[PDB]
Amino acid sequence: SATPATMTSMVSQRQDLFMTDPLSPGSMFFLPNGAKIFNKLIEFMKLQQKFKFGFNEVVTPLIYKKTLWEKSGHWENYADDMFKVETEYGLKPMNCPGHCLIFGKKDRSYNELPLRFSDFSPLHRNEASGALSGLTRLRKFHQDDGHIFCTPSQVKSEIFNSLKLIDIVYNKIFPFVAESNYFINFSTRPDHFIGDLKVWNHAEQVLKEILEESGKPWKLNPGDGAFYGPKLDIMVTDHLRKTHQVATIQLDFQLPERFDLKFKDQDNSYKRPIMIHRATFGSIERFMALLIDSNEGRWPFWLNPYQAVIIPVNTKNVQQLDMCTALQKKLRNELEADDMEPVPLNDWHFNVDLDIRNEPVGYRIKSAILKNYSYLIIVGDEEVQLQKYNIRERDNRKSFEKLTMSQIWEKFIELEKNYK
Template identity: 40%
Template sequence: MSGEKVKITLPDGSVKEFKKGISSHDIALSISEGLARNVLAAKVNGEVWDSSRAINEDSTVQLLTWRDDEGKSTFWHSSAHLMAEALEALYPGIKFGIGPPVDTGFYYDVDFGEKDFDSADIQKVEQKMTELARQKNEYVRSEVAKRAAIDYFRKKGDDYKLELLEDLEDGTISFYKQGNFTDLCKGPHIPNTGIIKAIKLTNIAGAYWRGDETRKQLTRLYGVTFPKKKELDEYLTLLEEAKKRDHRKLGKELELFAFSEKVGQGLPLWLPKGTELREKLVNFLKKAQLKAGYDSVVTPHIGHKNLYVTSGHYEKYGEDSFKPIQTPNENEEFLLKPMNCPHHCEIFKIKPRSYKELPLRLAEFGTVYRYEQSGELHGLTRVRGFTQDDAHIFCRPDQVKEEFKKVIDLVLYVFKSLGFEDFTTQISFRDPENKQKYIGDDDAWNKAEQAIIEATEEKGINTITVIGEAAFYGPKLDFMVKDALKRNWQLGTIQVDYNLPKRFELEYVGADNQKHRPVMIHRAPFGSLERFIAILIEHTAGRFPLWLSPLQYIILPISEKYEDYANEVNQKLSLKDFTGYADHRDEKIGRKIRDAEINKIPYMFIVGEKEEESRTVSIRKHGEGDIGSYNLEELLNFMNNEIDKSLAPDLK
């Protein structure tokens, strides 16, 4: 065996020979010492391994560092173990659930028994973790027989781990030990605790054991760690920034929207400025949809219960919805509209349709009501009454792909115009193992799924595919944008549906004079206006682009003497559909500027003696300051130019 070699293929394609049994750490060492120091784990033949694990056959090896997502999650997973070690040292006898990495950081579910773990304990744990990290204890893997593993945790009294063990097969069980802490874990882990340099516990929350609300609630401790102190500082700064941008805070400060407990939970009240913003967005999309061949429709806020029985929504969501409302005499039942599609299906059915009418694209800014669980409500992102920028495209089967592609174009145009340059997409298919969750036959689903695959391929957009995330009536393509703080938000959605047309018995007459069934595409580029505006607020930190800003300008007269001239300028601007006003308060100019800056008004036009005489305004841009004097015509051009620049060119 000694002297045998293995061929290692590295990501750059180069192949090197090493002694059989080499570890990826040593492979890194052969490249450079610095790299070896930074290697957290390695991907060997597609599987993430400990960097110390011996490689015994020819393999492709990718060394994972902090820069790789998998490197990060390994780092955080190991940090969860470190936190558990600290907790066990501080509070002996506690029991552990699971401790995985998450998007940013990690958590561990802990049963503290009688003890109340509160924020005062956090510092103690952080200190202990730091102390243990400094010991640079290695994470040591050992394969354990199931019997021995059960004995270990039984002796320790950790029921949760015993329960986890029940599902594991003998021969696949491994332990990891660092310092005095041993955990059931399949790994992998980073080499030693010393790499963890910066530690912060971020949150305490309750979480049910195995997500089951009938079972015991454990204390979930969230934390985040970094290999450098500086990165923790950056992360904390980012959190601060996120807090400043929170749409609930800015919505209040900028008077965009409000909630009232007298009106009801999750029912937003749109204030004048928020409404202005909303209407600007709506008009923007209406214009784009007009060019893309959509027809606008309006349907009522309630609909007969049977409509939703037909669509399947009632069966699926009826129990969790607002209860039906009834007519006084006949006791007919109506539902608050939870979806617009059934109404649009009925519009399709008002007369016999010819293939020549297709695709028929019906668009509605339709307000819908859903009884979201109270614990789910969150600012504008999750509410009980919201408006979808909804549309349903009824088309022939052979038009599905083309229509789907057109919708993709529209969605991308919207994103681009609103400054969301960075986005990802996800295709959601049904779970074939769990067909009772969905309606419709296999053939319809296969066709719909195929249409999405082909359309996205032909559009050249990169997608990830997730099984089991489809809507109950069809598969979908979702768009996720990254905002200015690199946070992911799910926005628009496009769904292909062969099922509702069947349920509503939609038909058109084809060129062959036979009846055919149309296909429906559901789509909403914003998703919900409420949610979209929340994201937009956080993305822009309330500094909306000029074309969207509810107040686009404010005129600031130096003193009362220039009130008339200020009003004259104001009138000229409002005639050109700009929104703003003149600040005639009895305040000094410095004060007026400060207030306008705080209110994030894009442009301030200062008028005094100089300006009145020369028929100009002095422009001050939000966040930037004085940018010079313009006469009124130049001013209008200046404003229009800026608006033109920010909208994406295609559909303008």
């Protein structure tokens, strides 16, 4: 009879992922295992954004004076959902205004467009306490945020590149449970919007054209556009057929005008850049919640905070213990605190545990299966003899391999490398 929210709480209790406290309602605590997943997702997304999709990361303030939010139009649209800060300040619910400040700080040439900034800042929104639900709706969350500044003729290609990244995430790297794991909502001009209505109709026309050219299924979603522009909202469906907004792409002609943004064009004319807002995960928190809704805790290897467990058949057998300890040390790849040798960059480190509890071998196994370890590694007398480990995958326990220490090292590397 379980809901998505309940599924998230069940997995979190089994794997020690997260916790909450009434001293900070709506703000999640990521415990070590929960934080490993969070950080892994961010590592993945940073790699795609920097070395494939042309983004440059920036780090921006969390609080801005009341004036910035008035200049942006946030203060009169959202201020009820905005935490005020007191010494006249607003705790940011969005990164965009900060990125406008960065754009307008230097002369900009058409030669550096499209200019793409990424930002993983924590955001706060004063969501009503009745709206709070697990990791899907929080008062504090992290967006894989990004703002693009381009020319009219670059809009289409930039949006298709955003859509390519979206497909890598939703239709290639991550399984979820249409052929596509999402549909698009075409979200149009809302009641309260800034800017002239002509510009708005043009932005909506550009977006519809791109939607049609993409060939992806979409739905009209009237009135749900941002206050600064219309958007494509990427909707995924949980197992209770309820839809959730994750990735989003927003076409913004309005903020550039309000920040008096300009760039020198090919003809030495000063012209306004167009701004595209975009997020792929949406928020890392909500994305994680939807992964869990699908995988029920059975993380893929590269993401799993429980990548492998090593289990000696006899916990008092020295030959088995040595062999198990040798492998754990190899796969964890840690250094001793006793010397001055630092951990080098780009080494591999795997989440590998050793269960030597004074418990029947059978129960230790069952324990590891409850935790969803990607791999179970057993060592008995025969394994000591061959100096080869019995290793089997979680979701295919019937088959198995007998591999050397070195072969497991390379196997785990290839898995993590390519997001298996």
